[PDB]
Every structure is written in C-alpha cells, then in structure tokens.
Write a protein that binds this ligand. Structure first.
Ligand SMILES: *[C@@H]1O[C@H](CO)[C@@H](O)[C@H](O)[C@H]1NC(C)=O
Lengths: 49, 48
C-alpha cells in the first residue's frame, strides 16, 4: 500500500485511479464504502488493515 | 444646497441600512448562481 500519489488502486475487486490518503471519516464498523454526491467511491477501508 | 446635501446623505444611509439588513433584494444575482449550481448538480447526478 502507498499513499500521497496517483496510483491505480484495486480494493476488494473495486477498481479506480486516484490519490490515496488518510481520511477522518469515522466509518461505523459495518460501513465499508463511502460515496460522494455522484454515487462515486471516495472512501474505503483496506481489507488488510 | 445644505438641505439637499442632508437629504442625499440620509438617503445613502438608509440604503446602507437596507442592504445591511436581512433584506435579500440581491435575489437576481443569487438566481444566476443558484440556477447554474443546481444545473451542475443535475448533470453530475446523471452519471449514476
Ligand atoms: C490479515 O488481515 C487482517 C484483517 O485486516 C489483519 O488483522 C492481519 O494483520 C492480516 N495479516 C495476517 C498475517 O493475519
């Protein structure tokens, strides 16, 4: 895992391109995916950590 | 001259108060910004 740079990430089969950084969104234990107003993924929990 | 000056200054003061107040006479500009904003939101939401 790498942060702060453009990378072709793949999380649990979900693919996307972007810059990954720590997020302050306090996801509840059941929550796994955050979405913006455009229904596009903007936050996620890594399965290994 | 002096009376006209006083009236002019008082008018300017009342304009300042009216704009300073909660009045929203600026609605026309707000419409221009708001309409474009919601149009953008609609276009973005269409991707889903
Ligand atoms: C495996 O994944 C779990 C859950 O993210 C994590 O706690 C653990 O450190 C990972 N590695 C090993 C060797 O279990």
């Amino acid at each position: 895992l790498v942060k702060n740079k453009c990378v072709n990430f793949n999380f649990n089969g979900l693919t996307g391109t972007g810059v990954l950084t720590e997020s302050n969104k306090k996801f509840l234990p059941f929550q796994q995916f955050g979405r913006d107003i455009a229904d596009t993924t903007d936050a996620v929990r890594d399965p290994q950590t | 001259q002096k009376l006209i000056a006083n009236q002019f200054n008082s008018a300017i003061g009342k304009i300042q108060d009216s704009l300073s107040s909660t009045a929203s006479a600026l609605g026309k500009l707000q419409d221009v910004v708001n309409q474009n904003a919601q149009a953008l939101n609609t276009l973005v939401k269409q991707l889903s």
